[PDB]
Amino acid sequence: PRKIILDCDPGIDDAVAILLAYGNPEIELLAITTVVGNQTLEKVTRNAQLVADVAGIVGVPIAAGCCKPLVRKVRTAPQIHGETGLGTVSYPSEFKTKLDKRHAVHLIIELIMSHEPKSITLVPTGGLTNIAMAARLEPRIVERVKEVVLMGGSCCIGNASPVAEFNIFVDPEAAHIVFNESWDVTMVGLDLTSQALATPEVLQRVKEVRTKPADFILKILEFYTKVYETQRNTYAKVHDPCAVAYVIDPTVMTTNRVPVNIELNGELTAGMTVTDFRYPRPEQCHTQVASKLDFSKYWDLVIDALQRIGDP
Amino acid sequence: PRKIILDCDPGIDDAVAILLAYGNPEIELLAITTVVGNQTLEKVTRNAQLVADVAGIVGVPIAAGCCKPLVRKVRTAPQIHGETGLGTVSYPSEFKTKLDKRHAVHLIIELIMSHEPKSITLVPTGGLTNIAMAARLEPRIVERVKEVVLMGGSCCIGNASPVAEFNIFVDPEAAHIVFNESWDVTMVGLDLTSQALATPEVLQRVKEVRTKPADFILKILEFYTKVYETQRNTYAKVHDPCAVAYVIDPTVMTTNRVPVNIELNGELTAGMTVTDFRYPRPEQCHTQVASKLDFSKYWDLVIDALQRIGDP
Amino acid sequence: PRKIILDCDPGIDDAVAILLAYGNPEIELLAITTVVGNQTLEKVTRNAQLVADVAGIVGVPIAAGCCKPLVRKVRTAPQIHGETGLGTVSYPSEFKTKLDKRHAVHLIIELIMSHEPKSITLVPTGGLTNIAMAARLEPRIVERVKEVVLMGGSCCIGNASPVAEFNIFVDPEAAHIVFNESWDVTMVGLDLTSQALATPEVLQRVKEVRTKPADFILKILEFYTKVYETQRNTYAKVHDPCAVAYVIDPTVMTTNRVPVNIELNGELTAGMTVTDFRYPRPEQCHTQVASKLDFSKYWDLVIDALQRIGDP
Amino acid sequence: PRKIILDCDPGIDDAVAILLAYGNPEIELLAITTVVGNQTLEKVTRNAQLVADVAGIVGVPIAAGCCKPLVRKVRTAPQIHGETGLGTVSYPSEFKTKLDKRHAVHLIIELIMSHEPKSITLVPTGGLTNIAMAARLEPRIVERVKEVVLMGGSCCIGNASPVAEFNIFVDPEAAHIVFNESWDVTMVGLDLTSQALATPEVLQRVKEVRTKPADFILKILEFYTKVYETQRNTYAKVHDPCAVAYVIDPTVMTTNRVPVNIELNGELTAGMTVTDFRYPRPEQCHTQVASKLDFSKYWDLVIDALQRIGDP
Ligand SMILES: OC[C@H]1O[C@@H](O)[C@H](O)[C@@H]1O
Ligand SMILES: OC[C@H]1O[C@@H](O)[C@H](O)[C@@H]1O
Ligand SMILES: OC[C@H]1O[C@@H](O)[C@H](O)[C@@H]1O
Numbered sequence A, B, C, D: 001p002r003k004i005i006l007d008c009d010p011g012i013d014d015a016v017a018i019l020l021a022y023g024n025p026e027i028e029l030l031a032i033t034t035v036v037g038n039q040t041l042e043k044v045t046r047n048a049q050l051v052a053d054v055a056g057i058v059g060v061p062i063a064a065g066c067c068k069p070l071v072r073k074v075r076t077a078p079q080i081h082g083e084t085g086l087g088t089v090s091y092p093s094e095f096k097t098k099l100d101k102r103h104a105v106h107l108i109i110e111l112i113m114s115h116e117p118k119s120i121t122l123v124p125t126g127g128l129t130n131i132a133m134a135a136r137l138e139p140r141i142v143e144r145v146k147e148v149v150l151m152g153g154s155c156c157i158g159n160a161s162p163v164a165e166f167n168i169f170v171d172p173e174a175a176h177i178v179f180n181e182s183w184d185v186t187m188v189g190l191d192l193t194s195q196a197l198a199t200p201e202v203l204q205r206v207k208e209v210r211t212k213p214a215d216f217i218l219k220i221l222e223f224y225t226k227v228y229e230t231q232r233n234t235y236a237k238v239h240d241p242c243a244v245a246y247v248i249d250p251t252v253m254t255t256n257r258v259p260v261n262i263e264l265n266g267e268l269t270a271g272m273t274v275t276d277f278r279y280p281r282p283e284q285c286h287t288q289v290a291s292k293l294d295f296s297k298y299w300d301l302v303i304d305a306l307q308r309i310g311d312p
């Protein structure tokens, strides 16, 4: 199995990504680390604990990371994930899954420096603040990581701005750090995740798993669906598990190696992932961008993970 | 017929656009105005005169405009259009078509203020310097123009930069002026013109027109083809007549009304046409962007214009 | 005498500059051209006509120029010059001084191309829009002008922003055009004009000229004084005649030749005149920046001009 | 005495600042932390060890921090501090002063969280990378610090660029983090430190201390002098001890409370400390900028520290 660290900001689709990573046997989930983004750090961390309580995730540390972007002001997304960050779910008075005492940045560094070289894939699905901080605090992690597979970016059409995707937009400086390090980066951007639609058939399949964790996922996906239908005129785009799915089986999506850099100073374009598709593409390009999704394979992976989790 | 002013920087595809505008009976070509861009102003103006000499264009003033962009340094494209701006053609010792004494900006203003309101379409196919200058020198032209239909811009993939198209890139400030005036603007960008391919069948049809102007077009298109095949790994994209074709018959391409603005200060993205496709689109949007080309109709229009010009 | 074109946006200190240029025998005032800035173009043009009516200026064309900056939105300064642009003065039902039929940009070009080379100094005391437009529409004026002496800019402390001075701030693109042309430019910036204080002794000297034009100047300077005392905690800074004064007698101020460029894209610094005082200064630098004012000589020039105008 | 952490990049004037902090009895020097800047991190850290060996500094941890700026590329200053970072001094085969095992960022956080609140002043005299990293990794340090007194910035004239000072220029993002946190910041910028001249009388006083550490300081100051005389046409500006001197005795310099922010995106002005001196100044402004130096008091403090260190 592939060892990963899942760095996230749950977040309704982050929650699905946690359960895909936990339920799929090709993934060894070493840690869930949280970052400010969809909601404040306090809220997304509580949300990660709720997901772990729901699915019975034991032995996987949950560590809270950065509560602010590197440079820019905090921006949250309650219009998409709700004031709580998980729609209309309710919370227990106390969580079974306790928080790790280590800052996420410290846990990321410790895991990378103590595991064998080239064995851990970083899977960020929120802003890149923790990843950037870790890379600058312990530069030896950059060559030691297997690769980075992140949900974020967009070649053309944004969501947080006309041209920028939310995870990059909320911390462009951190994204610039990650994309300009020498490690291999796979950008699973909106071009790809716009295809990860929670169609009625998908929601029906989740309902038919017939477990409490699947009921939980269906509940938050039904909230997420109403927001996307109302605010965006589409079915809900379940972005973040696409990054975990690539690690499970890269044939779940096509990719193209192209140069990618992060715009920091544009008036209209700050937070854009600027991609260069012009001919010729440079050789030994360390960045690749995802393009076409195997829709059936993707949702089969999500459903299979929910089936394997069962009713803990 | 629709009256137009064709503002251009010939330029191999500009030359095709001149002949489409001249040969098609739905266009009343009022003037050919030139601007620095593909080559220096002196060269592109001589090239416009050569095209007029080749096709026997009489009674249409050719006026030279701005020799520098508004703010940024002159950038030419000899790697695409040759050191002369028209590939390997030869020039007569003297042109039959003489240059108008008026600066292009003055001719544009004079034509718009003397013709009936809402009767003239501006068709820019180079940098937007002359159009911007005219709008600022005589602001009354903005409401008097029928509309602006320009070749330029790109929603996603650029040519002059990863994300910017040449005509916008060479004078972003002038583009910002044009796109932020109240007149209707149709942006016939690279998304559209990347489909205007000079395939072998197209070049064969040009050869079979069997006229000296068609031979001229075939010659410059064969140069243009070798440059695109070598530098870009595609057939040649014959961009500029797409803007004239829209004026002839808007059903030759689909369009979408979306907000468009011009990035001026990005490190990576200066010169980008930033388009906002997010839902919901604003009402009464004064900009629209072209999307899908009717390939057969487009090339039929070009071939028909060459047939109608005949051998003058 | 030195021929000048005074390009301005009256504007209380512009009005003083008009009368200094008109009254001083070392200046041959060829034209008053107006630009949007302190107020709308309509208002500052009416204000120029009022100044000409008050002082009996005959045979000097007043031509209205650009009503918008090149790229950025119109910004006016009614908090400094009043809703009318001249404080609380009243206007006649009809002006004696009629407006020239030519756009200011056309008049500037015509004057420069018809007078002997190197004989006319351009003296801008508003935004640089007209000057930039003229330079781009007829590039031959750049080498034909004697030099440009402008009121604008600041090495350190701004007024319109922390670091930018108003005339540059309201059209940074036009300033960038002017400062990057090859002509000699003298920047009479806030470092200098902050010393041009209308102290009680100065206002007393204006009162003692005992003419109707001096009464007019005293009236607008008393408004200007109340605004500066209230909003800025200083006496009024009478900036614009400093540029005319340099043309009369360059020993009225010290200058330093240093590179100067215009910031266009900074979030905080757009509109800054970026000056490079670091050692070593380049040779044959075409820009110089004013530093120390001969306070007594400056106000003696203003008072002498008012005395020479007398009561027309 | 005032507890400080001296964060620095020795650096010839940093070396003087270390000895002022060590020798003056009003300072309790808790740590010397190093950052990339004047030279690579490896070199400036070795240089800090050499200074500690020369002056016999025991019981003060030296901890190496960040080897790269947050976002931008490494920039060093061998033209000012030499290829080694300390001019032409020689190095022992082994240092007596050993390096702390903790990263500087970890040591800064540990010291602030373990000492009483509001007892430690941070004194950065290099790029602000470590300070910014510490503030983001443990946000509780921001309210716990007494204040930040840094050498960096400039109101008007820069050194690394026309308008930017080196320490801000080499990591503008880190500076933006520091200046936009709620802690009190005193900016001891070039306006102030340009007055800290190593005149012949100053160098003579250093020579007359007649100790090996003073000989060391004289040697590096003589190199520093030759660089400033040759490259800058001034005596050497000994910047960094000015920040320590303010902590010893704030009356050694005047200050003004004014808003200060950091320009990140300007083409010409990135790295500028943008100061707002316009009237009125906001109340309870958390930033102040140094202005006039008590030259005699400043150099008396430096000489007295060298005398107190003696010959260890
Ligand atoms: O732009 C998509 C990203 O933004 C969030 O709303 C989602 O969790 C996802 O990571
Ligand atoms: O980017 C396409 C544009 O650039 C030029 O090379 C062509 O003439 C066309 O107008
Ligand atoms: O910044 C000074 C400039 O701004 C205007 O208010 C004055 O007329 C002057 O030209």
Ligand SMILES: OC[C@H]1O[C@@H](O)[C@H](O)[C@@H]1O
Binding pocket: D011, D012, D013, D014, D038, D077, D080, D125, D126, D151, D159, D165, D166, D167, D239, D240
């Ligand atoms: O700009 C002055 C700063 O730059 C360095 O050269 C000095 O050590 C000082 O900290």
Ligand SMILES: [Ca+2]
Binding pocket: A008, A009, A010, A011, A013, A014, A038, A125, A126, A240
């Ligand atoms: Ca997420």
Ligand SMILES: [Ca+2]
Binding pocket: B008, B009, B010, B011, B013, B014, B038, B125, B126, B240
């Ligand atoms: Ca063209």
Ligand SMILES: [Ca+2]
Binding pocket: C008, C009, C010, C011, C013, C014, C038, C125, C126, C240
């Ligand atoms: Ca003015």
Ligand SMILES: [Ca+2]
Binding pocket: D008, D009, D010, D011, D013, D014, D038, D125, D126, D240
């Ligand atoms: Ca230093």
